[PDB]
């Protein structure tokens, strides 16, 4: 009887497609036209950070916009002082396979985890004086791709197989688990309020999850290839996704389809990372072509090129206050553009 | 700068020196990677070398050369999103079992386990990340193949077979197939030693292959290639 259920599901999907097609009133390009262009945004490297020895896979900015955590294939988790290029800490890790790193909003905990399919929580402000392991979260049957902090107690981990977990730190247990992705979930971005988070998998789908409830309210499928990085808008109205098909699409939660696409003929590489500048005029996208491109979010135009790296610009990030953008690459460098 | 600033920069300097010494002590350790179907004695080889845990690392040394060995068999994730972390690996140890040419495990209507390992080897060897990394190919059950070829010929697995049903000829045929799977012959080489419950031979071959590959890498980096 699976044929009847399958055809009913197909009919309902057709209903969804018809609904979203009917909701499309006018293109975002037409409405956004007649606005003042961004102009040639000039970006110059204020100061570079050196001391790693392998490829940097992840970086995260503190809420003070002054501290910076960097992860590398070398078993080091350096905490940087952005203003003065001083290394605050040097955290050795049990596994030298790191694919994500997070910095707690309170500034007390740092989480890293990679192919060792376990998330390690570190205490920075320790009474003794050295960085100690607080909790070694285990229970994911796959490499962690992105770990993020809701607060000092809850952490959301982008699993390797199909799932996401709302781990709590006090006890080694998962409060709720998220299923529904048909591929390896890679990116995970949190809303300005820690009530919704969107995730992208290696199956060309993005799902908006309700953290408190535990269900996928909306699903977004506009791309054709794997989704690598997702970043929310300054508000929770929309978000942008980067794919391996040399495109970045701005999806809208309220309207429930894609607003504008960001692609150019000269670009044939992938999107390693993506982030929004404050106030959301500029969309900063990392590329496999060893460069970062400054995309105007409102109008699909290239404001400028952030070209100061040798290799893959794996990790990218903009400070919460908004002064500077820090880009890390596969060479042991991490430059703070502004 | 203030007194706090001098102390902070001194702390940064000592952290930098600790990082440099850790990197210099880590750069002298040979890194290796293992791939196999899962029933190809990879665990058996790992146990022999010593004499949900997605990544497994084993330390061992031999003739004053530290060896880093990583096992990725228990991952169960699509290979593309994590295979680029192992770009600087000195060599890749590919374990394929020559005994189980027949006896498919996944689906009887599907191809043999030898064939699945053949596609795995082709994908790894022709990968764009491993364009300069050698493979130390391994064959696992020397004796099991010997005692199974007598009852069943090599023709039950390959239609284009033409040689006799002897041990040496069948071993040569399988070896030659796995050799000619490679497409960039100049940059990388295949070592293909035969081991089955033999002591002092596996580690000796690994050491010889590692010395050869490090010598060739030194020549390439020293303007003599």
């Amino acid at each position, epitope marked *: 009887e699976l044929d009847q259920l399958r055809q009913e599901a197909e009919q309902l999907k057709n209903q969804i497609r018809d609904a979203r097609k009917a909701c499309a009133d006018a293109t975002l390009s037409q409405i956004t036209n007649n606005i003042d262009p961004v102009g040639r945004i000039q970006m110059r490297t204020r100061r570079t950070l050196r001391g790693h020895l392998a490829k940097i896979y992840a970086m995260h900015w503190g809420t003070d916009s*002054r501290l910076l955590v960097s992860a590398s294939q070398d078993g080091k988790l350096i905490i940087w002082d952005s203003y003065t290029t001083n290394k*605050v800490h040097a955290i050795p890790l049990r596994s030298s396979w790191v694919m994500t790193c997070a910095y707690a909003p309170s500034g007390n905990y740092v989480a890293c985890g990679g192919l060792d399919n376990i998330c390690s929580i570190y205490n920075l*402000k320790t*009474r003794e*004086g050295n960085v100690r392991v607080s909790r070694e979260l285990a229970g994911h049957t796959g490499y962690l791709s992105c770990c993020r902090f809701l607060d000092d107690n809850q952490i959301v981990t982008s699993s390797g197989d199909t799932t996401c977990a709302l781990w709590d730190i006090e006890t080694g247990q998962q409060t709720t688990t998220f299923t529904g992705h048909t591929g390896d979930v890679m990116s995970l971005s949190l809303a300005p309020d820690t009530r919704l988070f969107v995730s992208g998998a290696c199956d060309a789908s993005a799902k908006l999850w309700d953290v408190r409830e535990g269900m996928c309210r909306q699903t977004f499928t506009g791309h054709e290839s794997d989704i690598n990085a997702i970043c929310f808008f300054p508000n929770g109205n929309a978000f942008a996704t980067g794919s391996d098909d040399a495109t970045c699409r701005l999806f809208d939660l309220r309207a429930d389809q894609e607003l504008m696409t960001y692609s150019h003929d000269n670009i044939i590489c992938g999107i390693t990372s993506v982030s929004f500048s404050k106030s959301g005029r500029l969309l900063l996208a990392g590329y496999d072509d060893f460069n970062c491109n400054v995309w105007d979010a409102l109008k699909a135009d290239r404001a400028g090129v952030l070209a100061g790296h040798d290799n893959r610009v794996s990790c990218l990030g903009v400070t919460d206050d908004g002064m500077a953008v820090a880009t890390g690459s596969w060479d042991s460098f991490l430059k703070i553009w502004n | 700068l203030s007194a*706090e600033d001098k*102390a902070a920069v001194e702390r940064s300097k000592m952290i930098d020196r600790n990082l440099r010494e850790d990197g210099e002590k880590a750069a002298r350790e040979v890194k290796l990677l293992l791939l196999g179907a899962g029933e190809s004695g990879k665990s058996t080889i790992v146990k022999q070398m010593k004499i949900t845990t997605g990544i497994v690392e084993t330390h061992f040394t031999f003739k004053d050369l530290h060896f880093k060995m990583f096992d990725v068999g228990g991952q169960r994730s699509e290979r593309k999103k994590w295979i680029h972390c192992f770009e600087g690996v000195t060599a890749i140890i590919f374990c394929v079992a020559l005994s189980d040419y027949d006896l498919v495990l996944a689906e009887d209507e599907e191809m043999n386990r030898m064939h699945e390992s053949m596609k795995l080897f082709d994908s790894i060897c022709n990968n764009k990340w491993f364009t300069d990394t050698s493979i130390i190919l391994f064959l696992n059950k020397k004796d099991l193949f010997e005692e199974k070829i007598k009852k069943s010929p090599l023709t039950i697995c390959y239609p284009e077979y033409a040689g006799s049903n002897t041990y040496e000829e069948a071993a040569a045929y399988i070896q030659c197939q796995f050799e000619d799977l490679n497409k960039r012959k100049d940059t990388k080489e295949i070592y293909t030693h035969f081991t089955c419950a033999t002591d002092t031979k596996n580690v000796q071959f690994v050491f010889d292959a590692v010395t050869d590959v490090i010598i060739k890498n030194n020549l390439k980096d020293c303007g003599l290639f």
Partner: single-chain antibody
Amino acid sequence: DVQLVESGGGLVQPGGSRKLSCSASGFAFSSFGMHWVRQAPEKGLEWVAYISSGSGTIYYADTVKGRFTISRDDPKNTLFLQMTSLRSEDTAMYYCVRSIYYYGSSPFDFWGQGTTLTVSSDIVMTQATSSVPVTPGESVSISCRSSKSLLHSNGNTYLYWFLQRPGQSPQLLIYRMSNLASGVPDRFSGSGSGTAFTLTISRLEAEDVGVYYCMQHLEYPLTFGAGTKLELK
């Protein structure tokens, strides 16, 4: 937890020499710079030495510049302070003080217990007040002044506040100026600007009684205040 127990000291002839030693107890001693603070029998606090993490900077005082040697050894987690010539003004009880220095750091966290040694320009802090009588509970303010402004170009002032309860070792109350410390309750607070810095305490109890000291951390010849004794009439 962290326990520093310094030891070694008796009677010294007026001109002899002795050696002080403080033993750490499992708090990653090698990563902490260590100080040396002494207390006259009925006077305030001085500062006699400083050895950094890794024995890099060995700043001394202007009165023990040549006759004092400070050294550390990473094994056994011990700090040394060796005397060569002891005067009559060197009689005191010496405190070993831990100090860690980075961006979000709290210098002068743990103080030692003390060893009695009985022999038998620089910024000056006034602390003009000597005794302010207090009630079982009320709002009390402690003031301070500095010769040179401690507001560096970085944007932070470097005046610290310490409390020495009768018969105990000093602690840390506000580890910078207007930056509440750890292990100290929310009653304490600080606020200041320019060269005038003040402390405020909301509710009194049998824990705010003692002597309160100030300290600057701009120029390494560190100075303390005269102290403000609270008596709780």
